[PDB]
Design a protein around this ligand. Structure first.
Ligand SMILES: CCCCCCCCCCCCCC(=O)SCCNC(=O)CCNC(=O)[C@H](O)C(C)(C)COP(=O)(O)OP(=O)(O)OC[C@H]1O[C@@H](n2cnc3c(N)ncnc32)[C@H](O)[C@@H]1OP(=O)(O)O
Ligand SMILES: [Cl-]
Ligand SMILES: [Cl-]
Lengths: 7, 386
């Protein structure tokens, strides 16, 4: 799994 | 390493020993790396002194509590270390007890003396369609080592032990995702985010006010209708299980990596559970269910709470996909989500920019264990993991 946020 | 340029330089002490293709390798075959084993190691792998294996019975509420505590304090974070997934007990039962689940595959590591839970990895069974082959595999999830045990080589032992436990059951392939680049991705996806409550997202630093744009301007850009527009949209019910199963199976045939779900598996993964999984079907003027959308719930602790929806499987045969996803956003907004997340897999690139999603900074790499096949573009990946 990966946790991403706006770039 | 999070990019294929960083992974170009490295060497892989553990993965070089495993039946996966080499990072440089370009693959034009389809099949196992090594043969099915007719004799399997009967003894668990040796752990460091003072640690021991334990299969976690998640029907025990205190054990389930130990697991989500381990995960909430030590599992995946955003790379800025601002937010960590906040896995609920009920979510974990959904993700970890699908049909065919096995207790030995909920594989824990405990301190011998105190019995404290300090490591975990899980396998769940899944039939997987990969190019022209259907194989029984497992999906590996929730590899977690306690922050104070990190970098002590416990992860490879967890991997070898769950591999052994899966081999004992006659299964020799696995699928798994990771944010890091390892030998060797079968496909690479990007996360995208759609603001629903922009005031909260900018306040909690999840997003930032874009260049020369006011707060008032930002809410206006992301404003959504109060009710969905698609005629006949309603929550999935028990009577919809067969047609949802039919719709999904036919729709997934166009992709190259997909699950093959039984009707019981469709019930488990899609039947709505508040604060876990939402599924809405489109029932038309003829009474026919022609489309459905689904997203699961995974909040994050602000290291309040960040309430996030994750796009799951969306199937269209008579409603335009664009319209279906607009209503998904409207529904998530109604249900109080702050952000709606989706990958660029399946046909999602056809709606991400149109619906004002913004690209994220992470990669989600997909991997097969002991299956050598050509890599594929994100739009041919038709498999979503939790
Ligand atoms: C037939 C059945 C087969 C079944 C098994 C199929 C394979 C299953 C594969 C796993 C599917 C997981 C699916 C998910 O759950 S993906 C989610 C992974 N979990 C997290 O991100 C939670 C937060 N992080 C942690 O808890 C730790 O950092 C973990 C436990 C991830 C690594 O622990 P630690 O930081 O203390 O490292 P180490 O010193 O002990 O060991 C490092 C070695 O392991 C390699 N590594 C690092 N991260 C990952 C990763 N995410 N997948 C595979 N390998 C990973 C690493 O490059 C190195 O190998 P090499 O560089 O030496 O070669
Ligand atoms: Cl269990
Ligand atoms: Cl094939």
């Amino acid at each position: 799994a990966s946790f991403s946020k706006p770039r | 390493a999070k990019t294929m340029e960083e992974a170009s330089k490295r060497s892989y002490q553990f993965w070089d020993t495993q039946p996966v293709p080499k990072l440089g390798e370009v693959v034009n075959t389809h099949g196992p790396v090594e043969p099915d084993k007719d004799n399997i190691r009967q003894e668990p792998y040796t752990l460091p002194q003072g640690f021991t294996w334990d299969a976690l019975d998640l029907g025990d509420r205190g054990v389930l509590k130990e697991l989500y505590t381990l995960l909430n304090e030590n599992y995946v974070e955003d790379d800025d270390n601002m937010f960590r997934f906040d896995y609920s007990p009920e979510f974990l039962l959904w993700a970890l007890r699908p049909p065919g689940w096995l207790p030995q595959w909920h594989c824990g590591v405990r301190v011998v003396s105190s019995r404290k839970l300090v490591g975990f990895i899980s396998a769940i069974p899944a039939n997987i369609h990969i190019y022209d082959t259907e194989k029984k595999m497992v999906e590996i999830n929730f590899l977690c080592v306690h922050k104070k045990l990190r970098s002590k080589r416990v992860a490879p032992v967890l991997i070898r032990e769950i591999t052994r436990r899966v081999h004992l059951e006659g299964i020799f392939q696995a699928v798994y995702t990771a944010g890091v680049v390892l030998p060797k991705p079968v496909g690479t996806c990007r996360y995208w985010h759609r603001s629903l409550n922009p005031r909260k997202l900018i306040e909690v630093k999840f997003s930032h006010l874009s260049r020369n744009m006011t707060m008032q301007r930002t809410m206006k850009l992301y404003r959504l209708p109060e009710t969905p527009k698609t005629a006949g949209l309603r929550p999935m019910e028990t009577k919809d299980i067969p047609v949802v199963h039919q719709l999904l199976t036919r729709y997934l045939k166009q992709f190259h990596l997909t699950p093959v779900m039984s009707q019981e598996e469709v019930e488990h993964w899609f039947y709505p559970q508040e604060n876990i999984i939402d599924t809405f079907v489109v029932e038309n003027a003829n009474g026919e269910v022609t489309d459905f959308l689904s997203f699961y719930t995974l909040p994050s602790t602000i290291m309040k709470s960040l309430k996030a929806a994750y796009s799951f499987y969306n199937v269209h045969t008579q409603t335009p996909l664009l319209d279906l996803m607009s209503d998904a956003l409207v529904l998530a907004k109604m249900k109080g989500f702050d952000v709606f997340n989706a990958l660029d897999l399946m046909e999602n690139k056809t709606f991400l920019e149109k619906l004002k999603f913004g690209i994220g900074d992470g990669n989600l790499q997909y991997y097969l264990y002991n299956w050598k096949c050509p890599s594929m573009g994100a739009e041919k990946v038709g498999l979503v993991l939790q």
